[PDB]
Amino acid sequence: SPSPLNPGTNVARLAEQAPIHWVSVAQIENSLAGRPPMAVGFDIDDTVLFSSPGFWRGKKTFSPESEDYLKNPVFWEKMNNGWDEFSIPKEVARQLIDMHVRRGDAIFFVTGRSPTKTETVSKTLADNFHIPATNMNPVIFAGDKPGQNTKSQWLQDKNIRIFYGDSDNDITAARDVGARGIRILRASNSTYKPLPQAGAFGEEVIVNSEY
Amino acid sequence: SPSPLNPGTNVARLAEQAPIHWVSVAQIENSLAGRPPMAVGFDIDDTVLFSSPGFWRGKKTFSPESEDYLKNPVFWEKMNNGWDEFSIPKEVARQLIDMHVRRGDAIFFVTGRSPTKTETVSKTLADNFHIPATNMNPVIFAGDKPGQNTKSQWLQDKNIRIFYGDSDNDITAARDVGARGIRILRASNSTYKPLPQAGAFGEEVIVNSEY
Amino acid sequence: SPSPLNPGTNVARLAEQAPIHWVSVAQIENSLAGRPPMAVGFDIDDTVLFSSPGFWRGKKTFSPESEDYLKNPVFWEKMNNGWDEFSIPKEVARQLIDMHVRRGDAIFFVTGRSPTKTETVSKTLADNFHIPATNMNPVIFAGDKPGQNTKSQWLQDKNIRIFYGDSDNDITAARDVGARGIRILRASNSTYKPLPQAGAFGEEVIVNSEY
Amino acid sequence: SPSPLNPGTNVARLAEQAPIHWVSVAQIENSLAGRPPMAVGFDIDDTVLFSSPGFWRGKKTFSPESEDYLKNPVFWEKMNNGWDEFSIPKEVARQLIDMHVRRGDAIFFVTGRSPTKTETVSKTLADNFHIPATNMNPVIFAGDKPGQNTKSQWLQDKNIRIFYGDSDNDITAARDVGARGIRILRASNSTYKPLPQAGAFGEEVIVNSEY
Ligand SMILES: [Mg+2]
Ligand SMILES: [Mg+2]
Ligand SMILES: [Mg+2]
Ligand SMILES: [Mg+2]
Numbered sequence A, B, C, D: 001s002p003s004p005l006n007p008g009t010n011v012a013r014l015a016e017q018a019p020i021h022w023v024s025v026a027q028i029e030n031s032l033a034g035r036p037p038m039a040v041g042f043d044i045d046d047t048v049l050f051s052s053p054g055f056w057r058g059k060k061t062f063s064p065e066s067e068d069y070l071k072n073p074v075f076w077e078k079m080n081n082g083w084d085e086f087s088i089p090k091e092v093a094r095q096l097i098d099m100h101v102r103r104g105d106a107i108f109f110v111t112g113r114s115p116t117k118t119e120t121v122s123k124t125l126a127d128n129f130h131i132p133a134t135n136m137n138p139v140i141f142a143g144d145k146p147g148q149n150t151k152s153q154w155l156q157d158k159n160i161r162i163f164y165g166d167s168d169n170d171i172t173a174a175r176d177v178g179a180r181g182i183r184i185l186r187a188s189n190s191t192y193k194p195l196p197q198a199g200a201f202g203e204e205v206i207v208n209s210e211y
Helices: A011-015 A025-031 A052-062 A073-079 A091-103 A121-128 A152-157 A168-177 B011-015 B025-031 B052-062 B073-079 B091-103 B121-128 B152-157 B168-177 C011-015 C025-031 C052-062 C073-079 C091-103 C121-128 C151-157 C168-176 D011-015 D025-031 D052-062 D073-079 D091-103 D121-128 D151-157 D168-176
Strands: A021-023 A039-042 A106-111 A160-165 A180-183 A204-206 B021-023 B039-042 B106-111 B160-165 B180-183 B204-206 C021-023 C039-042 C106-111 C160-165 C180-183 C204-206 D021-023 D039-042 D106-111 D160-165 D180-183 D204-206
Touching (some): B025 B204, B152 B168, C025 C204, C106 C160, C160 C168, D151 D160, D168 D180
Parallel strands (some): A160 A180, C160 C180, D021 D204, D180 D204
């Protein structure tokens, strides 16, 4: 819709802050000081990888006019077996993963991506984030089923105590099992829109976590 | 009105900028390099002085339930003859005035305050801003008359080429005479509300000018 | 080292957030649901009153070249017996005090201002913040002079459970006695500089609390 | 020197604005009212396409330990003949190109990418940006190799009046030939780092242009 040519602003607006519990990686690490090794988990897409390139390619290739590609097995086979070569790792994830390896934590990736016959995503993550064998676990492809949070049972089964993610379902999955859900900002150039309201559950949101 | 307990945010919103032509004092000075002395002008209230203390006192004393104090001669006599001892000079004004003195410009103050029998505001300004006799001019008390911009004729008469102010009428007074109107941000703790939309005429707005 | 004429910016900087635990008045109220009436406390200067007008006048009048006015009984007698008529109440304080009065909480003000023979600050506060007799308490002048008690000691004595303040010492006083210290932003046009780093101890900071 | 665990902030910092000449697409369009059809130009990378996915893949694949991939013809052949299928078009570019097409302007793309035997980038751009045949022009590969012309020379040759770009060199190329250089923000998740200082030459910078 049209809007004023010169909208202007004012210093109340310029200074205005949403009441969000922002945290840093250093603050998270400090909050865990002395805690022995435990399981933690990460969403993948827009949490540790900017994977829009593959999802964008998939949409254009398989369903230019809809979201049907996301239920298309042919898309998932491409997405999970090499299109992540184009996925850009997020610095926030490098920092979190390093921190959790430092702690001796077991690292899980729990994604709403659909399972495929083979997958190279686990290797991509281990390689890009320099995750040792002992801390690494194969990616859990939990899928996406409207009406159910497919991640919650996985967080319970793996006794995941902190779950990082960009989407509301990541935070509520953590809430479902009494884990600590921590929000990462989805980048504004992500093709997955609209952007979620980070902090909408009163959860911690990591500063500067869009890259 | 009520609003969500946890509203959240997103990185598009966090990065979002209004299309405003922000400038610095240094940029203004540079834009004038080589220009010989000329007349420039300043609004007073929320431009060079945070004078809300006196206006706040005036409202409480003379019309706690209305804006009638602003048409009350007894208020103006107090406001213009000592209540500016409580008015806090703005750093942006110190910087602009110093810059204009450096240039050899003639400095005018054009205020919508009502004229009084005597006034000590001119002395307050000369003293607080260290304005030499040659650059200083007595404050012009132009008053406030709905339906008229009382400042425009003054800017014309004094051949003022740049006019600084926080209010829309300051900018449009400059526009009226073809002067360069430059916006200063009104502080968010000013008692003069609502805050104006700085930049709403496509004018330059000085960064960080709320203090 | 250069402060370039055209410094530019980038979107990392534009979106950058300090890791602050921001909260709203509504969130604080929510945290207190079902809690019986209790004592709460406020610092005065830059917490509930923008009192810089009086402090500015005091400095110019009594020690233009130093900070000695703050040790000058002549200044304090003026500051505590009427110059607060020029102090601007903060909206954040209106909201907090209203919320606490509604809870049936006792309202205390604990200030580091030097004590005087008489003071009219208590009345100024009760009048401006519409504090009912049953919730109102005379201002406490805390400090390190003989016969005085510290802010910490007074918080302990009055069983103050939450203490609101803009300075580091307000937060540490609360924490020394196991009270909840909550930070209010000092306005950028305050004459008390430098501005504190709100959130420096990981405490809650109230959003938009500069006005 | 310390990066404190709890750094805090203050309202001067929160409200702080860089002195940038921000503009909107609507403001640019307004500035062109009544101007006949003309040639305009765009840089490609981080201006119209977030092409970091291909550049990221290229670096990992061809020079994981250096920047040598950018001198590797094998990389450029991949980058210019299909890896842009994974590049994410920028909304700011959709708006600008739409606006310019509506004006009947000629659309040029002038890139510093190394030239290849064949390229499919022109088609990618025409398809994604819905650029009609009459407005579309094949991508120009500019540079300093033998037989090439510089960006400046091409802007001169094609009578390009406005040039959009994210890098300093895009702005200076425009200015060297008297064209209007307008800056687009590079996304913070770009792999081309450090981010430029948008506005470093006092040029117009498009608001919200990181996506
Ligand atoms: Mg995700
Ligand atoms: Mg004014
Ligand atoms: Mg205080
Ligand atoms: Mg570029």
